[PDB]
Amino acid sequence: AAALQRKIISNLKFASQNNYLPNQSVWEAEISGDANHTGITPVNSWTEG
Amino acid sequence: RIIGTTHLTNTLSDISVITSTPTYGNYATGFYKGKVANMNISTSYYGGR
Amino acid sequence: IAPYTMTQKDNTLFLGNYTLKRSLISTELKNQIKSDSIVTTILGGLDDAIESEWNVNTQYNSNYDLNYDSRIKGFQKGEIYRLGIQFQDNKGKWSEVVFIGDYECTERFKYTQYDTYGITLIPRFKVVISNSTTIQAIKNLGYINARGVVVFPTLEDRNILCQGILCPTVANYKDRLDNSPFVQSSWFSRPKQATETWKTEYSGTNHLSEFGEVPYFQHNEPIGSASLSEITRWEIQTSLGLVPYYNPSTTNAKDFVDGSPSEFLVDENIVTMHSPDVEFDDRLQNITNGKFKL
Amino acid sequence: ITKDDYNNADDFDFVGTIHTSSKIEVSKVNGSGAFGQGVIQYAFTYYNKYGKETNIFRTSPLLYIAYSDRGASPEETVSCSFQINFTELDSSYDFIRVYSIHRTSIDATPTVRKVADLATDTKLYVDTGTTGEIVDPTLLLYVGGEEIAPYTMTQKDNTLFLGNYTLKRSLISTELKNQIKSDSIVTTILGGLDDA
Amino acid sequence: HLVFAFNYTESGKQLILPMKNNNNGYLAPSANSKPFWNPTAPEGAVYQDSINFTNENRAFFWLAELYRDSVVNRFGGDTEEAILNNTWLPSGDSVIIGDSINIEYTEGDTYYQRYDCLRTFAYTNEDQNSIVDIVSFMCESKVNIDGRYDKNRGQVNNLAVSPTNFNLFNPVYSQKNNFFTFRTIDYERFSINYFPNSITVTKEKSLGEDIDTWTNITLATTLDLDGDKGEIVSLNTYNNEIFCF
């Protein structure tokens, strides 16, 4: 009874404005000589699979 | 004439089970998918499996 | 053309032994213009300068820029652009280009949504030449006007590939142990919160459901919980909020996961960048192991 | 007769001469461009402005128009671009011409394109598939032309006539062929690519 | 979309997006507890930094950029030689050369438009549980995002949206100033401009309300005489026939 058939949820987050960091506080994954700030793996584009 | 061999290292395996009728147990789990052989090339000992 | 002789038959003019009078700019003057160019980047805008169509009194306002000219285009802040300058004769004939140098932008776009209007600032280069000798030399060549000319960068030589938000991913416990999937796109987008007051909101009667539910966005926080104080946050019915951490001296990994194998964890260590260029430009959807920095 | 730097007897022949040892390598850049699926081969030839034209002195090997991780369907267009790295060109010539033999099947009539007429001192050029005039495949054999020993000439309507001509064909004598065969020390080696 | 992963720290921990103003950090593990996917992990097994950014006081996504550091031979080379092979485009309105030249490059190549990323949609139209997730935000792009010609924009419903309905795109609006394009010219290169044996021919004078065809020379109907007789000394007409000396 009251068995589910089809339920759907929608969401549209709206960003009315973008706040940009000053040059000093920019975050970079790579900082040479920094043990913690290691970089990024090779980028990959996902399409279907 | 046999000239060489093949260095098997891993095997990518998958399983799928579909049943016409439901499970016998009213609260049974049904099809359970376990871990089998989906390992990197580095673990070459378990090759040809 | 500088012909030598003419005839006139059937209302048609003939012109023989002609020289194509081509007027060029000497190399020394080109170098002088290059040296005398004081190029700077400024934050300009459109003539209107006030977009009253957009206000904060509405659920959604699409910033539509096709009702203006093509001067809406700007310059990426970290990009390199090969700039130049042209000159116009008394007839409207544009001269060749005078390469002045490759110059990097230094100001980004800026959209600020005020109560009743929004202000957008478009970065623009600005070349200033004040050496009166150079200007007089240019005028002596018959030039009157001047215009900006640029070579835009191709995708191969671009410093910037794309720009977009960062969305945390999610991973199931059993699949992650199996590594069939290890991560996957989050069905819900998971923004970070600027403050920690939402934690106090999820306590007692403070949280009214009409405000909306903040998703599970912390790194290893399970998507789920047993606390009824935050029940509306639950995204999966079969979740128990099992933490993805176990003591190796007590239980194995498989045994620990078997307590809730259908439990999911967030993953901010592996992300999914969503840029418009990837969706719209089909050349970025075929990247395979591209070496880039973030 | 308005040039006074003639130093060799081959400077006067109809077909141009190449003095420098051109080294032109072609590599595939992936990510930008618009090419058709198939294999592509590049051919080069110098030519003076209003002057002579050399034969096809260098031809690149076949390059594959495919994706960075898979082949291309017969009906797919690939976003590839080929960078041409010229080195030690014959600067005495006004231009260096670039061709592109494109095959879309097995032993099919290719689609020759006239890519560009670059200066003989340029060091790099990236060939996106957009630009280029589709020339007939058969005129890659007419580049430079034959070497004939005519007897008389005329000149009507800016066209040159050449009568009683001998096709100067230069062959290799049988004894020299046999000497080359005997003097050939052929061996098999285990080489690799430049990257390695 | 694009998917990548931060590299582990040199100590073996995980690198994570920084937490703004040291708020809402990662879930720290208990003592002597390891992740189930990495038993051989260091204590804590997580590294996270913070950015002292105060202008943002609401929820946000870290807006980021795929930086590329080394680019050899950007536009084919830095020399005049490479610049010769480049194609140039106009940018900005023409200004008069007075006591000084002040140019302003109005038209570039980057836009700044609202982008609605349909991150997630339904696997099928008959399944039980499906999710639709959209993130509308402003971003910089080289593609005219406002060319989206579908009317399913900024609506609360967003229930039946899909790649077939939500983000249809008309590429034409992302067009450059390609029609009028110029390029650099070498001064010392010798390109001839003298044609002693050549006759240009204009169009027959219309004698209607349009331009004078004689003043408009296009060199589209040239005619070259033999160069081994001499330059064109004179052209004359006699009884309906042109004669060239």
CSV table of C-alpha atoms in Angstrom, one decimal, chain E residues 10-236:
chain,number,residue,atom,x,y,z
E,10,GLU,CA,54.8,13.7,1.5
E,11,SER,CA,53.8,12.3,4.9
E,12,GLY,CA,51.1,10.1,3.3
E,13,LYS,CA,48.1,12.2,4.2
E,14,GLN,CA,45.3,13.5,1.9
E,15,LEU,CA,45.4,17.0,0.5
E,16,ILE,CA,42.0,18.7,0.7
E,17,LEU,CA,40.3,22.0,-0.4
E,18,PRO,CA,41.1,24.5,2.3
E,19,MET,CA,38.6,25.4,5.0
E,20,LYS,CA,37.7,29.2,4.9
E,21,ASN,CA,38.6,31.0,8.1
E,22,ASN,CA,39.3,27.7,9.9
E,23,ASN,CA,35.6,26.7,10.0
E,24,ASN,CA,33.8,23.5,9.1
E,25,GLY,CA,36.9,21.3,8.9
E,26,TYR,CA,37.3,17.6,7.9
E,27,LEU,CA,36.2,14.7,10.2
E,28,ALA,CA,39.3,14.0,12.2
E,29,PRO,CA,39.9,10.3,13.0
E,30,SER,CA,40.2,9.0,16.5
E,31,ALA,CA,43.6,7.9,17.9
E,32,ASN,CA,45.1,4.8,16.3
E,33,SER,CA,42.2,4.6,13.7
E,34,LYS,CA,43.0,4.1,10.0
E,35,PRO,CA,40.7,4.5,7.0
E,36,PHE,CA,39.2,1.3,5.7
E,37,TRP,CA,40.7,1.9,2.3
E,38,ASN,CA,44.2,2.6,3.6
E,39,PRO,CA,45.3,0.6,6.6
E,40,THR,CA,48.9,1.7,6.2
E,41,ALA,CA,48.2,5.4,6.7
E,42,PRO,CA,49.8,8.0,9.1
E,43,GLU,CA,48.2,9.4,12.2
E,44,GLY,CA,45.4,11.7,11.3
E,45,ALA,CA,45.7,10.6,7.6
E,46,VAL,CA,44.3,14.1,6.5
E,47,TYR,CA,45.9,17.5,5.8
E,48,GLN,CA,43.8,20.6,5.4
E,49,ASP,CA,44.8,24.3,5.2
E,50,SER,CA,42.7,27.5,5.6
E,51,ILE,CA,42.3,30.7,3.6
E,52,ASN,CA,41.8,34.0,5.5
E,53,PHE,CA,39.0,35.2,3.3
E,54,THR,CA,36.4,37.4,5.0
E,55,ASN,CA,34.5,39.0,2.1
E,56,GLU,CA,32.5,35.7,1.7
E,57,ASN,CA,29.9,35.1,4.5
E,58,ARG,CA,27.5,32.7,2.8
E,59,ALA,CA,27.8,29.2,1.4
E,60,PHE,CA,30.2,28.9,-1.6
E,61,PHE,CA,32.1,26.7,-4.0
E,62,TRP,CA,35.8,27.1,-4.3
E,63,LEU,CA,36.1,28.7,-7.7
E,64,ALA,CA,39.3,27.5,-9.2
E,65,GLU,CA,41.4,27.4,-12.4
E,66,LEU,CA,43.4,24.8,-14.3
E,67,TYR,CA,46.7,26.7,-14.4
E,68,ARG,CA,49.4,25.7,-16.9
E,69,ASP,CA,52.9,26.9,-16.1
E,70,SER,CA,55.3,26.2,-19.0
E,71,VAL,CA,54.2,27.1,-22.6
E,72,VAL,CA,57.0,27.0,-25.2
E,73,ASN,CA,56.4,28.9,-28.4
E,74,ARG,CA,53.0,30.4,-27.5
E,75,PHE,CA,52.1,32.1,-30.8
E,76,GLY,CA,54.6,30.2,-32.9
E,77,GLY,CA,57.6,32.2,-31.6
E,78,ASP,CA,58.6,35.6,-30.2
E,79,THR,CA,60.5,36.8,-33.2
E,80,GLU,CA,59.2,39.0,-36.0
E,81,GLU,CA,59.6,35.8,-38.0
E,82,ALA,CA,56.9,34.0,-36.1
E,83,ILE,CA,54.7,37.1,-35.8
E,84,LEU,CA,54.7,37.2,-39.6
E,85,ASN,CA,52.8,33.9,-39.8
E,86,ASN,CA,50.2,35.0,-37.2
E,87,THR,CA,46.7,36.2,-38.0
E,88,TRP,CA,45.5,39.4,-36.2
E,89,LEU,CA,42.0,40.6,-35.4
E,90,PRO,CA,40.7,44.1,-34.7
E,91,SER,CA,39.9,45.2,-31.1
E,92,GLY,CA,38.3,48.5,-30.2
E,93,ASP,CA,37.1,51.6,-31.9
E,94,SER,CA,39.3,53.9,-34.0
E,95,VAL,CA,40.5,57.0,-32.1
E,96,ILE,CA,42.1,60.2,-33.5
E,97,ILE,CA,45.8,60.7,-33.2
E,98,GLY,CA,46.1,64.1,-31.4
E,99,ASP,CA,48.9,65.2,-29.2
E,100,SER,CA,49.0,61.6,-27.9
E,101,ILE,CA,47.6,58.2,-28.8
E,102,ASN,CA,45.3,56.5,-26.2
E,103,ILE,CA,44.0,53.1,-27.4
E,104,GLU,CA,41.5,50.9,-25.5
E,105,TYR,CA,41.1,47.3,-26.5
E,106,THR,CA,37.3,46.9,-26.0
E,107,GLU,CA,36.7,43.5,-27.7
E,108,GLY,CA,38.7,40.5,-26.3
E,109,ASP,CA,37.8,36.8,-26.2
E,110,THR,CA,36.5,36.1,-22.7
E,111,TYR,CA,32.9,36.4,-21.6
E,112,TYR,CA,31.3,36.6,-18.1
E,113,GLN,CA,27.9,34.9,-18.1
E,114,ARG,CA,25.6,32.9,-15.9
E,115,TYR,CA,26.2,29.2,-16.3
E,116,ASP,CA,23.6,26.6,-15.2
E,117,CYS,CA,25.5,23.3,-14.8
E,118,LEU,CA,23.0,20.4,-14.9
E,119,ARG,CA,25.3,18.3,-12.8
E,120,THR,CA,22.8,15.4,-12.3
E,121,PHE,CA,19.6,14.1,-14.0
E,122,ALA,CA,17.5,11.0,-14.1
E,123,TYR,CA,18.8,7.7,-15.4
E,124,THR,CA,15.4,6.9,-16.8
E,125,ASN,CA,11.9,8.4,-16.9
E,126,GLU,CA,10.3,5.5,-15.0
E,127,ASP,CA,12.8,4.6,-12.2
E,128,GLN,CA,11.7,5.1,-8.6
E,129,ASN,CA,14.4,7.4,-7.2
E,130,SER,CA,16.0,10.1,-9.4
E,131,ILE,CA,17.8,13.4,-8.6
E,132,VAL,CA,18.1,16.6,-10.6
E,133,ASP,CA,20.9,19.0,-9.5
E,134,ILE,CA,21.7,22.4,-11.0
E,135,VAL,CA,24.3,25.0,-10.0
E,136,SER,CA,23.6,28.5,-11.5
E,137,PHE,CA,26.7,30.7,-11.2
E,138,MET,CA,28.7,33.4,-13.0
E,139,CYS,CA,31.9,32.3,-14.7
E,140,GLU,CA,34.5,33.3,-17.3
E,141,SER,CA,34.5,31.4,-20.6
E,142,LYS,CA,35.6,31.7,-24.2
E,143,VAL,CA,32.2,30.5,-25.4
E,144,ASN,CA,29.1,32.7,-25.4
E,145,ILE,CA,27.1,31.0,-22.7
E,146,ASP,CA,24.2,33.3,-23.3
E,147,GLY,CA,23.6,31.6,-26.7
E,148,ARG,CA,21.5,29.0,-24.9
E,149,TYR,CA,18.3,29.0,-26.8
E,150,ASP,CA,16.1,26.8,-24.6
E,151,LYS,CA,13.4,28.2,-22.3
E,152,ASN,CA,14.0,25.9,-19.4
E,153,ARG,CA,16.1,28.5,-17.6
E,154,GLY,CA,15.6,29.8,-14.0
E,155,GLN,CA,12.4,27.8,-13.3
E,156,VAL,CA,11.7,26.3,-9.9
E,157,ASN,CA,10.3,23.1,-11.3
E,158,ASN,CA,13.4,21.7,-13.1
E,159,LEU,CA,11.8,18.2,-12.9
E,160,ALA,CA,12.0,17.0,-16.5
E,161,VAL,CA,15.2,18.7,-17.5
E,162,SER,CA,17.9,16.7,-19.2
E,163,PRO,CA,20.7,17.2,-21.7
E,164,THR,CA,18.0,17.1,-24.4
E,165,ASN,CA,16.1,20.1,-22.9
E,166,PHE,CA,18.2,22.1,-20.5
E,167,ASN,CA,21.5,23.3,-22.2
E,168,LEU,CA,20.8,23.5,-25.9
E,169,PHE,CA,23.4,25.8,-27.5
E,170,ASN,CA,23.7,27.9,-30.6
E,171,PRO,CA,27.4,28.2,-31.4
E,172,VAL,CA,27.0,31.1,-33.9
E,173,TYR,CA,27.0,33.8,-31.2
E,174,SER,CA,30.6,32.9,-30.2
E,175,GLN,CA,32.0,34.5,-33.3
E,176,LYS,CA,35.2,36.7,-33.6
E,177,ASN,CA,36.1,39.6,-35.8
E,178,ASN,CA,37.2,37.1,-38.5
E,179,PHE,CA,35.9,38.9,-41.5
E,180,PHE,CA,38.4,41.8,-41.5
E,181,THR,CA,41.7,40.3,-40.4
E,182,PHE,CA,45.2,41.7,-40.9
E,183,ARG,CA,48.8,40.7,-40.4
E,184,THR,CA,52.3,42.0,-40.2
E,185,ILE,CA,54.5,42.9,-43.2
E,186,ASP,CA,58.3,42.7,-43.4
E,187,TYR,CA,59.9,45.9,-44.6
E,188,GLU,CA,63.2,44.5,-46.0
E,189,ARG,CA,61.5,41.7,-47.9
E,190,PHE,CA,61.4,42.3,-51.7
E,191,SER,CA,57.8,41.9,-53.0
E,192,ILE,CA,57.5,43.6,-56.4
E,193,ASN,CA,55.1,46.4,-57.1
E,194,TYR,CA,56.0,47.3,-60.7
E,195,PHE,CA,54.3,45.7,-63.7
E,196,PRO,CA,55.8,47.2,-67.0
E,197,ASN,CA,53.9,44.6,-69.0
E,198,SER,CA,50.4,44.7,-67.6
E,199,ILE,CA,47.1,46.4,-68.4
E,200,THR,CA,44.2,46.7,-66.0
E,201,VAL,CA,40.7,47.1,-67.3
E,202,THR,CA,37.8,48.7,-65.4
E,203,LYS,CA,34.1,48.0,-65.7
E,204,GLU,CA,31.9,49.6,-68.3
E,205,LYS,CA,30.7,52.9,-67.0
E,206,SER,CA,27.1,52.3,-65.9
E,207,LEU,CA,26.2,56.0,-66.3
E,208,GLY,CA,23.6,55.4,-63.6
E,209,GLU,CA,23.2,56.5,-60.0
E,210,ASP,CA,26.2,54.7,-58.7
E,211,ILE,CA,30.0,55.3,-58.4
E,212,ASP,CA,32.4,56.1,-61.2
E,213,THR,CA,33.7,52.7,-62.3
E,214,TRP,CA,36.9,54.2,-63.6
E,215,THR,CA,38.1,55.4,-60.2
E,216,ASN,CA,37.5,51.9,-58.7
E,217,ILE,CA,40.5,49.8,-59.7
E,218,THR,CA,40.4,46.1,-58.5
E,219,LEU,CA,43.0,44.5,-60.8
E,220,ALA,CA,40.6,41.7,-61.4
E,221,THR,CA,40.8,42.0,-65.2
E,222,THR,CA,44.5,42.4,-65.9
E,223,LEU,CA,46.2,41.6,-69.2
E,224,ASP,CA,50.0,41.0,-69.5
E,225,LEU,CA,51.9,41.5,-72.7
E,226,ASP,CA,55.2,39.8,-73.7
E,227,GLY,CA,58.1,40.9,-71.6
E,228,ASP,CA,60.8,40.3,-74.3
E,229,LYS,CA,59.6,43.2,-76.4
E,230,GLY,CA,59.6,45.9,-73.8
E,231,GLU,CA,57.5,48.0,-71.4
E,232,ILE,CA,54.2,49.4,-72.5
E,233,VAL,CA,55.3,52.7,-74.0
E,234,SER,CA,51.8,53.9,-75.1
E,235,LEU,CA,48.2,52.8,-75.4
E,236,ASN,CA,46.0,54.3,-78.1
